[PDB]
Structures are given as C-alpha cells and as structure tokens.
Amino acid sequence: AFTFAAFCYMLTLVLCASLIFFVIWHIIAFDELRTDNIERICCLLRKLVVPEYSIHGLFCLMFLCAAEWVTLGLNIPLLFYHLWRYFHRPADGSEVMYDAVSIMNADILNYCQKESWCKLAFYLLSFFYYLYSMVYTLVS
Amino acid sequence: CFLAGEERGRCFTIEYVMVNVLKMIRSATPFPLVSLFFMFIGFILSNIGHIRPHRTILAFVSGIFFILSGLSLVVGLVLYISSINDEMLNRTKDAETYFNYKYGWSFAFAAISFLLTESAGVMSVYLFMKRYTA
Amino acid sequence: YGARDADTKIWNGMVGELVYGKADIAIAPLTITLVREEVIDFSKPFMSLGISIMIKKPQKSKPGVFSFLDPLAYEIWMCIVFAYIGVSVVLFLVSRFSPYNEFGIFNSLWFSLGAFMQQGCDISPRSLSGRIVGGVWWFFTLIIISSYTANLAAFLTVERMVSPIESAEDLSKQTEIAYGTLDSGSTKEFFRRSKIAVFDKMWTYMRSAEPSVFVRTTAEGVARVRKSKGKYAYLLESTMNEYIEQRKPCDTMKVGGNLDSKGYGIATPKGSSLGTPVNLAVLKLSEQGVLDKLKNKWWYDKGECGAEKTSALSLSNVAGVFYILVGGLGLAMLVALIEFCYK
Amino acid sequence: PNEFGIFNSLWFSLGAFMQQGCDISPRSLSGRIVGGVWWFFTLIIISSYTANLAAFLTVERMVSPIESAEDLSKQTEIAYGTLDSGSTKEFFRRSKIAVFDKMWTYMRSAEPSVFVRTTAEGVARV
Amino acid sequence: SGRIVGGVWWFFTLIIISSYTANLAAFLTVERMVSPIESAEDLSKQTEIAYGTLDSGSTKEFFRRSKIAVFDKMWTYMRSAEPSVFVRTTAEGVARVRKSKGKYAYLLESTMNEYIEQRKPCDTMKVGGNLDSKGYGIATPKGSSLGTPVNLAVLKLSEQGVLDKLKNKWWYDKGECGATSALSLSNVAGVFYILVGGLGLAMLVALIEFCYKSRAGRKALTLLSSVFAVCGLGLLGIAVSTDYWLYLEEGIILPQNQSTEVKMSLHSGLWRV
Amino acid sequence: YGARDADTKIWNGMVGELVYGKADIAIAPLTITLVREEVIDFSKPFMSL
Numbered sequence A: 001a002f003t004f005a006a007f008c009y010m011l012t013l014v015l016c017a018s019l020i021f022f023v024i025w026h027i028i029a030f031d032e033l034r035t036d037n038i039e040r041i042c043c044l045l046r047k048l049v050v051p052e053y054s055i056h057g058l059f060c061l062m063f064l065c066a067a068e069w070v071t072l073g074l075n076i077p078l079l080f081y082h083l084w085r086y087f088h089r090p091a092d093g094s095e096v097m098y099d100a101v102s103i104m105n106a107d108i109l110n111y112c113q114k115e116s117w118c119k120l121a122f123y124l125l126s127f128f129y130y131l132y133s134m135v136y137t138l139v140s
Numbered sequence B: 001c002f003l004a005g006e007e008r009g010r011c012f013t014i015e016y017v018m019v020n021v022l023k024m025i026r027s028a029t030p031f032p033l034v035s036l037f038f039m040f041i042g043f044i045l046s047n048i049g050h051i052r053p054h055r056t057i058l059a060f061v062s063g064i065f066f067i068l069s070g071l072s073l074v075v076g077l078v079l080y081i082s083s084i085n086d087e088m089l090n091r092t093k094d095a096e097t098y099f100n101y102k103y104g105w106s107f108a109f110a111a112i113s114f115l116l117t118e119s120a121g122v123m124s125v126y127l128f129m130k131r132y133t134a
Numbered sequence C: 001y002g003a004r005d006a007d008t009k010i011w012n013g014m015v016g017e018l019v020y021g022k023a024d025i026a027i028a029p030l031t032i033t034l035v036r037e038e039v040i041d042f043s044k045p046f047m048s049l050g051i052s053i054m055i056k057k058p059q060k061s062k063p064g065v066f067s068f069l070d071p072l073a074y075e076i077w078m079c080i081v082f083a084y085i086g087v088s089v090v091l092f093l094v095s096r097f098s099p100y101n102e103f104g105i106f107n108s109l110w111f112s113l114g115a116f117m118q119q120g121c122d123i124s125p126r127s128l129s130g131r132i133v134g135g136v137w138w139f140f141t142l143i144i145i146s147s148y149t150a151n152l153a154a155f156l157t158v159e160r161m162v163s164p165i166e167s168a169e170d171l172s173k174q175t176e177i178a179y180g181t182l183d184s185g186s187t188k189e190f191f192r193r194s195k196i197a198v199f200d201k202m203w204t205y206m207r208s209a210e211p212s213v214f215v216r217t218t219a220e221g222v223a224r225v226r227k228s229k230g231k232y233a234y235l236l237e238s239t240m241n242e243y244i245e246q247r248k249p250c251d252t253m254k255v256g257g258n259l260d261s262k263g264y265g266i267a268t269p270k271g272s273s274l275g276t277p278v279n280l281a282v283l284k285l286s287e288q289g290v291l292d293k294l295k296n297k298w299w300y301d302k303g304e305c306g307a308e309k310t311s312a313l314s315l316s317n318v319a320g321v322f323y324i325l326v327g328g329l330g331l332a333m334l335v336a337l338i339e340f341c342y343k
Numbered sequence D: 001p002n003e004f005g006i007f008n009s010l011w012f013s014l015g016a017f018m019q020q021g022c023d024i025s026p027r028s029l030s031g032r033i034v035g036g037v038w039w040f041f042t043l044i045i046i047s048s049y050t051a052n053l054a055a056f057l058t059v060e061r062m063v064s065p066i067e068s069a070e071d072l073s074k075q076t077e078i079a080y081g082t083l084d085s086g087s088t089k090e091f092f093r094r095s096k097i098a099v100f101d102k103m104w105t106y107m108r109s110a111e112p113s114v115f116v117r118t119t120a121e122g123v124a125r126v
Numbered sequence E: 001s002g003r004i005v006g007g008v009w010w011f012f013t014l015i016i017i018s019s020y021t022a023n024l025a026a027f028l029t030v031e032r033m034v035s036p037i038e039s040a041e042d043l044s045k046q047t048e049i050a051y052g053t054l055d056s057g058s059t060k061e062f063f064r065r066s067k068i069a070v071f072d073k074m075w076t077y078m079r080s081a082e083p084s085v086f087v088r089t090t091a092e093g094v095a096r097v098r099k100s101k102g103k104y105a106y107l108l109e110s111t112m113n114e115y116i117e118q119r120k121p122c123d124t125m126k127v128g129g130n131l132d133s134k135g136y137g138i139a140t141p142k143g144s145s146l147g148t149p150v151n152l153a154v155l156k157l158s159e160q161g162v163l164d165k166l167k168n169k170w171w172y173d174k175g176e177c178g179a180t181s182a183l184s185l186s187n188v189a190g191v192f193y194i195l196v197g198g199l200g201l202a203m204l205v206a207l208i209e210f211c212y213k214s215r216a217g218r219k220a221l222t223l224l225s226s227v228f229a230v231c232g233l234g235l236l237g238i239a240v241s242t243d244y245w246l247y248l249e250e251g252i253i254l255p256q257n258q259s260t261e262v263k264m265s266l267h268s269g270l271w272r273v
Numbered sequence F: 001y002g003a004r005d006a007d008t009k010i011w012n013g014m015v016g017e018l019v020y021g022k023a024d025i026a027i028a029p030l031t032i033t034l035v036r037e038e039v040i041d042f043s044k045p046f047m048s049l
C-alpha cells in the first residue's frame, strides 16, 4: 500500500535521474577538456555541482523524516565526502568555489576522472536500490 | 469581584481564593504585561529621539517596541479568549441551567490599545524616514 | 449482606437471619458464593452480572494548538511538505537547465507556495517542461484543498464522540487513566487472588499507585469519576453500573463486557420447605420474561436519563493558526535583522 | 534593497484575505515569510467559513418536524402531556399498543408534571 | 470576443469546482453518519439488514413467546419476511452472514458467537449485549448422592478462576484470529501518482528540448490537415452509421451466490436497437 | 440435548440418559430450563450466556 516511506522512494527515483545526468555531463566535459578550453569549462562545470549536493542534501533530510535508517545510512558515505569538498578542500576560487580556479595542474585531472566514475557507480546503484525499496514498501 | 449572587463586596484576589477558568486566565496574564512594558520602552525611547535628533535610530528602534507590544496584545487576547471558551466547553451539559460570559470595558481598552500603538508604530517608522532623508 | 466472623464464627446480615431462625426467605441481591452455599440454600440466579468498568461519559474534547491540521492525517501533511520541495527542485532543474530564467530556487519555492495556497502568482513558467511541473502541482493543490474543506465539513456536521477505554485490556495498557476499586469487598478480593493474565497486571497497578485509587464508599467512587474529567475509571458491579448510568446527571458510562460471572440468588434456610418451589419459581419468571420486564422497569423505564443546532466556531478551535501567524511574523522580523547586518 | 508602503501593505493583505490578489508581490525573504504565513492564515479561515456554513445548512436540513405519535415517542426532547383527567389520559393508561405504551411510560414518570389541569392551560403551555 | 470565451469558461469552472467540493463533503458526511449495529433496538429500527434465527430451538421460541417491546417487533419482522430468514443449521446461518456482504445478521447463542468469531475465516463479529440471560449447568439424576458435591465444586472452580481460565484456553488461546476520522493517504494516493508521474514526464521533456535547442512549413500542414479531416469524416462516419452506442442490461439478481440472469440485454444506436 | 415428546411424555438425549438411569452425571452445555429442573438437578451455572 502507498505510505509516506513509499513516497520518499518515489520522489528519489525522479531526482536521481537528474543526478546521473549531472555525471554523464561530468564525464563528457572533462573528455572534451583533454581534446582541446579552460575558461569555458571553468564556468559550465561550476554551475552544476552545488545542485548535486543539495539534491543529495534533500535525501539526507527526507529519509531522516521517513524513518528509513538503512537508506539514510547508505547515503552517509556520499554525504560526508561532500562536506569535505566544501568545508575543508574548497578549491578557493573567490567565487562559486569548485573546479574553475586552476585547471591544468595535471594532478587534479586524475582526481576528477576517478571521481567522475565513482559518482556514476554510486548513482546507478542508488537508482536500483531506490527502485527496489519503492517496490518493497509498496508490496509489503 | 462578585455581585448579585452571594453579593459579597469583598474583591477576592486570584491567589487567596482557592472555578478552573480563573486559573486559565493566569496563563494569559504575562502578555498584557509584556505589552505594557514594550509600550513604556517604546515611549521613553521616543522622547529621547525628540530631544536628541542627532542620532536618528532612536525613533525607529522605538517603533519596533510599539509593534512588538501589539503582537503581544494579539497573542494575549487570543490566549485570553481561547481560555474562556475551553472552560465553557468542559462543563456538564444540562438544559435546566444557563451560562453567560461577556466582556467589559477593561477588555475593550486593551483592544483599542492595539490600534493606537500599531498606529504609533507606523508613525514612528515614517518619522525615521523623514529624518534619515534630511 | 452476610459474612462469617473470623473469631466468633457468627454470621451477620441477611445470611445470619436465615441460619439463626430469624427469617424464612431472603429475596434480596444476595451473591451466590461458596461460603454461603454451605450454610443456606440458593435458587437458580434471577440476575447474572459481574465486575464492569464505569468511566465518565465522553465530551467535546477541547482542541490543542495544531487541531487545525486534523482534517488531513499527519501522513498526508508530511507528504505535502516533501512534495512542495519536491516540485520546487524540479521547477529549478527544468528552468535552469534547458531554459526558455526567472526561476531560481528562491523563486521556485515562491511559485509553489503561491500555487498551493491558491494565491495565484506573479510569474508563470514559459517552457513546456516548466508548465507540466506547474500544471500538475495546480491539480494536486485543487484536490487537497477541496478535501481539506470537505473533510472539515463532515466533522462539523456529525459529532462523533469516542471513548478511550472499551475493555479492561485497554486499562491495563495505559497509565494515563487511573483505575481503582472499593477499599474492601468482593471486587477488591477479586483482583487480589486472580491469576489470568491481565487482572494480575491490574492488581500490581492498584496496590502501589499514589494517591490511593481505592475509595471508601461507592458514592465516593462515583464522585471521583464525575470529578476527574475522564481520568478515573471505577471498577464495580454491573448492576449498580447500569443504574448510576441512568440517574441524574448523565455523567457516567458503562464500557466493555463483564470481567467475571456471578449471580444473585433467592436464599432459604437449609432444609426449608420453600427451597424447592422458589427454585421452580425463578425459572418460571425467567422464561416468561418477567425478570427481564422487571429489569427494564426499574433500571430503564424509571431511568432519569432518557434514550443539534450547529454552533459557531470558537476561537479555541483555530487558535493555533494565530500562534503560527504571529510566530511567523516575529520569525520574519529576525530575518530582516540578519539581512540588515549581513548587508 | 519602495512599492510596499502602509497603504500598499493594507492592499496586499486585503487582496490576500479575499483570495483575489493581483498586485505587486514581495521579493525579500523577510517580506515573503510574512506574505507566506498570512496566506496560510486565510487558507484555514476561508475553509472554516465554508465548512461551518455547510454544517449549519445541513443540520438545518436534517430537522424533521413532528408528524406522528411515533415521532413523539422517539424524540424525547419535546415534552408532551394530556389533561389531568378524562378519556385522553385514560386512553394511554389502558393501551396495549406499542407506540402508545411508550408514550404513557414517558408521561407517568416525568419531572415536572406534563399533565395540565385545563384545556386552556395546555394550550397556554404550548 | 476574447473576453466572452474567457468569461463563460470562468463561470464553467466556478460551478464545477464548487460541485467537486460539495459532492465530496456530501460523501464524507454520509460516510460519517453510518452507525453500525450494536444492539437489538438497532436491528428493530433498521429494516434494511435482514436478521433471522435457526428454524427450531430455544432462540426461535424466545421471540415467539416474548412480550418485551423490542423483541415483539423483531418477531413480527421475522415471521413475515420474503424470503425465509430462518436457516436450518448453525453452519448454514454463518454461511449466509459471510455471503451477504453485511446485509444479513444471525441471532445465536453467545458462546458459539464468540467461538466462530475466533475461527478462520475471520469474517464475523459479536455485537451488543445478550438479549436474555440463561446458563449451562452440570446435571444429576434428581436423587443422586453426587449433586451436592458437584454443586459445591462448580462454585469453587468459579471463584478460583478455573472456569475463566478454561474459557480463555479453548475460545481464545486456541483461537485462529488475532486479539481516526481523518483523511488517509490511501484515498488521495492517486493525486501523488500523477504528481510524481507529472514531474518525471516534465524532466523527460527537458531533455528533448535541450537536445532540440542545441542541435538546431506549408508542406507539413497541408499533409496534416488532410489526414485528420479524412479520419474525422471516417471515425464519425462509421460511428453514426453503426449500432454500438449503448450497451444496456436490465437483469435481476438472486440471493444465491449472487446468481445473475439477464432479461433485457441490448446494444443500441441512433437508428437500431 | 433433551426434550419431552408431547405424545409419549418421554425424554430423548442427555436428559433421557439421566432420568432413565443410563448416566450418573452430564458435564455438558446443558441449559438450565424449567421443564428440565423438574426431572433432574442442575448445579449453579458454570457458564452464563
């Protein structure tokens, strides 16, 4: 039957469909960065990343109020990584504060490309974990 | 103070007498006192803004105490009225009796006093915008 | 009624006048027990009864602060809030990425608040994909506000008072309502030596609770029901419980079934010539409906309690909206103070 | 960082109570909380006006007037009585019909006395 | 000319939205007026739920001999009712309760009623108090040397709770069953489905605008306004010239597993019936 | 359970086996009735209903 927890899983299939689109667009923009480009891949990426936190920041406050402690628990490792990239390693910028300030230092390129396939591996598993516990709470 | 039913002229106070609504009006007691305090703060900081106009912020801050007072009337007058109707309801319904509560000229004077210190709140902020542009 | 003394071994009351020759029959509410059957002779029971529960008859049950939320369940109101942010993020994602904008996250929380409160808007989405978010949240709003009003109009039309206690299992599962028997007697003795599952739970409560849940007189126990606004349930026999319910005022109520089974008998001395024809007389009066007809007459047809005009809404019902309003006015004055300091 | 003076604020809040408001809208966050909790105020009040009026008009439509003796025997909120003597009081005393035995049971035990002494007294009590 | 169409559409929606709310407030009020049966006086007044006893025994002879007002009314209804409300077996009367969807009540003893309540399927329940008061006894041959110690044994077992312990053992502990007035999510669940379905549809359109904005006459509209006008002449031309407009039935029901027999089944048109 | 045939004035069932000596006692759901109390001796009710 339809319940409040089963709505919190319906509402996160729709938003993690945008979170994978943040990452498919994140692997192409660095692939086109190596072929060519700095000041445009400064701005086009820097607009994307703060929507990626607060949509996941919604999920931390949505499954907290839904009393889904295992689902809140599996979003904890992506959450506390996201606080480190903004509170302690902010890539200063003096502006929207992400991968703009310096680009071709050639060490952060290897870190972003490992991150760009680590996000897609988490989100595509999150899409089917949310789709399972949607169908779990609807049938049960 | 009683009249016409066991007509005792002794005005009993609220602590040296013991009806449950007389304890329910104690819950709505501090808000007409927070109202009276903020009107007094808003008035003494309004005359200072008349005798020392070199710092203009005396008028606008006194405008806020005029309006935070009026919000303490409204919560006070809702709490006063809602505590009446709750004890008018928690009684044994009997069709051979009747009940009657009314309000008097002390309840009205606290109600009109909301209109005049929200009017004093608007006129103090318009007074601040005349001083600051000069 | 009759009790053998522990020291003098002398029966008193109506049992003592049948053992000691001062009487010939006891047509009385005399409980068929073990220790009385050994000395006198009962008939078949003319009235079957037991221990029952007397609570105060429920009332209009005064509102809280958040009583205005009650036409919709609390599971709906949480689904409304999270779908409010749920359609505000999707307004943001659609109008920023692939734009036509004016619809940042602070204007998408204000379009959706203006849409739910049915206050219109100042801006409307201009893309197709922004007008499907705005167009379906309008249809969601139309069903929820029309079902807030319609479920509220059902509540105010049909008054329907429910009692919190409908069993003695339910008295055992709570500590809000304090229950107590008389200080002595058969109801006091019943819960002491009971062993079922529940009357042992109900006895560990009553023997320890402060203040004393045991009244001294039945009239003290009825007054403690009427003067405890629904917090005292008096455990007593189901014949006084059905009669005090029919006296004035109509302040009390019998709930649940009986807790045990006992009877009232017509007693004769042991060896009397009346013992057989009175025994056959009670079973004539039972099967002809005479004992039922005499019970309807003295409990119900001579009952003082027997067996509209919708009133205006008092301020108590909707007082919590005025609290949130002024609490939302003072919360808005704080944000301007932080806006003036930050800028 | 106006359009929101005290006479445009008395017109925004009047257009928001009537649920009619096309005008300027608040743009500051501190101006949109006061505009937001006033919108939630009027959503509860206007839904309480309509629902309490629909509760009045329904209960005023449920009211069935007396048109039988079975309507008097069920509704024990209108008192009814006969004259203190005569054929009408002796009719219900002797009756073995179900609805009339119920009416005599109510009239014989009712406080105060429902039985008037004169016909002009019983019309007076009505 | 644009403000008349904008004006009569505004008057359309004022009647429809006021008809949605008022018909929903009529449903939720009538669904709140519904009082279930909790007495015999509720069965004697409500003559829409049928009720009956067994065809023989002490229960049918109770109402036949009764001079109490509410019980004389119940016997008057049961003695003249079509079809017969009196079942022949206790298992037949429980069967009629379980297959009449709540339109049949059965009058039986209090100890079978509390027993069938605790046996699968958990379809039935006991309502109200008992109509009369009788008892079960242990019997002896009227001249035995045993009837007096048995009489003192029943009154000892009753006061030691053994008769209450054995009743909980066989009615409830060996039973097979168990033992808000506000609007629930299950009633308005489908407006959250269209909301979630309307958000996911609109993010799908946000892709195929972004792919259409980034990547980039009379010949199409001549082609499109012809095939829709032919099929407009088609689909109405078939429809008015056929006879499949109104499937209509006028059958009758039976109270025997809802046996259905049609008698006036039909399919109609504007010119054929 | 027990009933008197009005023609024969005879008891069939468990009241028949107590009046006519076949049984010594009947622990059973046997209703305390007027027409049964005349011919056999019931105890106090072990179950009220």
Ligand SMILES: CC(C)CCC[C@@H](C)[C@H]1CC[C@H]2[C@@H]3CC=C4C[C@@H](O)CC[C@]4(C)[C@@H]3CC[C@@]12C
Residues within 6 Å of the ligand: C334, C335, C338, C339, C342, C343, D029, D030
């Ligand atoms: C919730 C209460 C009790 C305290 C929190 C309120 C304050 C501290 C928070 C919440 C809203 C935040 C806003 C953040 C952005 C804007 C925009 C800026 O141009 C000025 C201030 C302003 C308008 C807000 C200042 C106040 C703010 C930083």
Ligand SMILES: CC(C)CCC[C@@H](C)[C@H]1CC[C@H]2[C@@H]3CC=C4C[C@@H](O)CC[C@]4(C)[C@@H]3CC[C@@]12C
Residues within 6 Å of the ligand: A010, A013, A014, A138, E193, E194, E196, E197, E200, E201
């Ligand atoms: C846009 C997508 C990815 C988000 C979730 C899809 C939702 C909206 C769709 C998927 C298919 C639909 C299902 C339809 C059938 C059943 C049966 C119904 O009795 C309840 C709900 C249930 C179990 C489903 C609910 C969810 C549903 C309405």
Ligand SMILES: CC(C)CCC[C@@H](C)[C@H]1CC[C@H]2[C@@H]3CC=C4C[C@@H](O)CC[C@]4(C)[C@@H]3CC[C@]12C
Residues within 6 Å of the ligand: B027, B075, B079, C065, C323, C324, C326, C327, C328, C330, C331
């Ligand atoms: C702190 C800032 C945001 C302003 C708060 C507003 C204050 C003045 C108001 C608004 C809502 C009010 C509360 C409302 C509910 C209860 C219950 C009531 O029986 C008495 C008062 C009491 C306990 C509160 C008194 C204080 C009150 C908090």
Ligand SMILES: N#Cc1ccccc1-c1cc(-c2ccccn2)cn(-c2ccccc2)c1=O
Residues within 6 Å of the ligand: C060, C061, C062, C063, C064, C067, C068, C069, C070, C071, C072, C151, C152, C154, C155, C156, C313, C317, C318, D044, D048, E180, E181, E182, E183
């Ligand atoms: N009365 C009233 C009322 C007025 C405005 C808003 C809400 C209510 C209200 C509604 C309900 C309710 C409940 C179920 C179904 C429908 N409505 C209940 N209450 C209420 C009344 C007394 C105490 C607590 C809540 C209420 O106060």
Ligand SMILES: O=c1[nH]c2cc(C(F)(F)F)c(N3CCOCC3)cc2n(CP(=O)(O)O)c1=O
Residues within 6 Å of the ligand: C001, C002, C029, C030, C031, C032, C184, C185, C186, C187, C218, C236, C237, C239, C240
């Ligand atoms: O044989 C008995 N029959 C009893 C009958 C009744 C009554 F209900 F009035 F019929 C009462 N009351 C119950 C409530 O308090 C007032 C009197 C007590 C009785 N007692 C004493 P108990 O059983 O020890 O409590 C007997 O002994």
Ligand SMILES: O=c1[nH]c2cc(C(F)(F)F)c(N3CCOCC3)cc2n(CP(=O)(O)O)c1=O
Residues within 6 Å of the ligand: D085, D086, D087, D088, D119
């Ligand atoms: O033969 C009789 N005919 C009666 C005729 C009438 C009248 F209605 F006036 F015609 C009346 N009244 C009834 C109303 O109050 C005024 C007098 C009483 C009559 N009685 C006495 P009752 O019937 O015992 O009360 C008779 O005996």
Ligand SMILES: O=c1[nH]c2cc(C(F)(F)F)c(N3CCOCC3)cc2n(CP(=O)(O)O)c1=O
Residues within 6 Å of the ligand: E056, E057, E058, E059, E090, E108, E109, E111, E112, F001, F002, F029, F030, F031, F032
């Ligand atoms: O002494 C009697 N005790 C009885 C006891 C029961 C039972 F409930 F099973 F205990 C029943 N049933 C009622 C329900 O259907 C199954 C049999 C009948 C009894 N009868 C015959 P009745 O009372 O004339 O119908 C007696 O005579």
Ligand code: NA
Residues within 6 Å of the ligand: C153, C154, C157, D054, D055, D058, E025, E026, E029
């Ligand atoms: Na209605």
